[PDB]
Design a protein around this ligand. Structure first.
Ligand SMILES: OC[C@H]1O[C@@](CO)(O[C@H]2O[C@H](CO)[C@@H](O)[C@H](O)[C@H]2O)[C@@H](O)[C@@H]1O
Ligand SMILES: OC[C@H]1O[C@@](CO)(O[C@H]2O[C@H](CO)[C@@H](O)[C@H](O)[C@H]2O)[C@@H](O)[C@@H]1O
Lengths: 335, 335
């Protein structure tokens, strides 16, 4: 006897009690219509399993039936989910509304977290800041690259600077070093944050999560600026001098700082007009910045069509514009 | 409106129509008890999804609910299958009967085939012969090694000999070269065969399959002997001189041929006694072989406790013993 088990139950989460009790036998021995003996005579269950891909029937006289192994049997079932999921993702893109309550999704484990991290990076349109412990880098190496290729800027914060050869042309890549980081923070387009805690789930420690709550974004944006203040800029790769993107204005300004002197810079910015609240797209020359760390101010001075303006980043209040959507196009080498 | 879709149906393969229509909304927008509006008032469906891991609820006044993405949502569902599958595999091992009708399982694609190949290798207890086109090698490189480590002998047939450094101590590895091979044949312990056709599923070409039918084993064993006759022996790695295993006596004998001269060899064989039909385990010294290719004979002459005997491989009829279970232990270097 197969002897069933609790397994019986779970599978009755989705599975017939006949569809369950026909497969049981075929795995435990492999007959034809002996199945039909223990215990119901109807073979409808077999016509079932055949479509699921859990059984094929082989030339017969009498006809005989055989079960694929758990491994192959579910490999097929998993492959089915992929399709529900992707097709489900695809429709979402064509009909998902935009104004959504903020929330927070906790993750059950390191893998699942990395899954949430990747999902986030995939959506990146402008910049992603990734604070990480050297330990994790090898796990995100491909995703970093893939992202960089969509022309998205990537601001990395790492402790032990790895071998960055793979990256020589891949995109707009900035690398900064910092004493030591414990967990992985990941922020994409100033829109959402995803976090992963060091190594294995370390017993009862902080949870790994994604979140869109302003408080946590503000929290974390502020955290990053602190690590920025002490961090040192080790690698800079402009693989796209005519489309350099930032969501983090302090990163914007860091960059402008390094170049504005030896060449002109042009900008296109979308942002809230602090005076009016209205969204606007602005273009001009960058003719100055202020990056005052104690004063807590970082912004750009943009020469638009009609006068200078100041554009500051997320949560700005004192400049003319608040922006998290920034594009520099770089003037020419000489000057 | 989410607008449902065919997707609705499939998911009703397993999923409630409420459990399906609650998730729909949370993905399309993210509220609390607005769900309850369109269209049923009962929130039992939410208590459902919560256990599936498809939704968490967040601190409320009122209380509010949010859905994980398809990606994470199913990542969790897949992770569940793993457990049904493994737990299901585990029990099988403890209760699966042995005498089973022969059958044949066709595979739907290259991946699934490779899945069947691996599954087979995993079970290897003695030897696996793997005829393969150079193209596939990188896909089986790890599995080859893993297998080699369980102390299992691995007889490879390849066309373009790859870099075999990874393998210097890994096990008992024999490598033979052959002009060109089109598809992957894989035979494990003379018990079952698994086959994969070149590259992508090439439209309407031969199917990829596993099978235990004697005819196909005999077929394929015979096929391999042909490729053996023309093939050349390029690499030989005895990483286990005291336990060298074969299921293919012609491979046995090839080996004995190369060594018997410069050192003694000992054997332990399990096989059918052709005179009596009875199974027996025999041990002795190997004092000779015959490997006559035209005559279609290959066997070993074993000096047992009480006289010489001849042991031939699968399907043997003229020797004293038919064996597919063979272990040589190698005498010492000098002589
Ligand atoms: O940098 C200080 C801190 O204050 C906030 C919130 O009011 O606003 C500043 O942020 C801008 C860039 O993001 C500054 O340039 C601007 O002067 C000011 O609004 C946060 O943004 C920031 O964390
Ligand atoms: O090698 C010939 C061919 O004939 C078979 C089937 O009768 O039997 C031979 O196989 C043995 C090794 O497997 C030989 O040594 C033996 O003499 C003979 O039984 C098949 O085995 C084989 O394909």
């Amino acid at each position: 006897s197969h002897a069933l088990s609790e397994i019986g139950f779970t599978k009755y989460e989705i599975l017939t009690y006949w569809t369950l009790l026909v497969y049981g036998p075929s795995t435990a021995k492999e007959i034809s219509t002996k199945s039909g003996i223990p215990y119901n005579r109807v073979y409808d269950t077999i016509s079932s399993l055949k479509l699921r891909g859990f059984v094929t029937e082989i030339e017969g006289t009498p006809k005989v039936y055989a079960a694929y192994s758990p491994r192959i049997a579910f490999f097929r079932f998993k492959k089915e989910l992929e399709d529900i999921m992707k097709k489900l993702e695809i429709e979402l893109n064509n009909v998902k509304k935009e104004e959504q309550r903020p929330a927070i999704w906790r993750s059950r484990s390191f893998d699942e977290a990395i899954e949430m991290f990747r999902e986030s990076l995939y959506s990146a349109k402008n910049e992603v800041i990734v604070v990480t412990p050297s330990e994790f880098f090898e796990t995100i190496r491909e995703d970093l690259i893939k992202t960089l290729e969509r022309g998205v800027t990537v601001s990395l914060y790492i402790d032990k600077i790895p071998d960055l050869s793979e990256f020589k042309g891949k995109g707009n890549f900035f690398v900064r070093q910092f004493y030591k980081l414990n967990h992985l923070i990941g922020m994409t387009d100033g829109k959402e944050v995803v976090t992963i805690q060091n190594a294995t789930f370390d017993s009862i420690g902080p949870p790994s999560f994604k979140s869109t709550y302003p408080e946590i974004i503000f929290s974390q944006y502020s955290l990053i600026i602190e690590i920025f203040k002490e961090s040192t800029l080790e690698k800079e790769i402009i693989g796209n001098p005519k489309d350099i993107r930032f969501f983090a204005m302090f990163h914007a300004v860091d960059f402008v700082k390094n170049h504005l002197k030896n060449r002109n810079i042009y900008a296109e910015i979308t942002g809230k007009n602090l005076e009016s609240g209205r969204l606007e797209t602005l273009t001009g020359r960058v003719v100055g910045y202020t990056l005052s760390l104690r004063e807590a101010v970082n912004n750009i001075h943009l020469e638009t069509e009609n006068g200078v303006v100041k554009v500051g980043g997320m949560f700005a209040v004192i400049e003319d514009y608040e922006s998290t959507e920034i594009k520099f196009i770089m003037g020419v080498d000489l000057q």
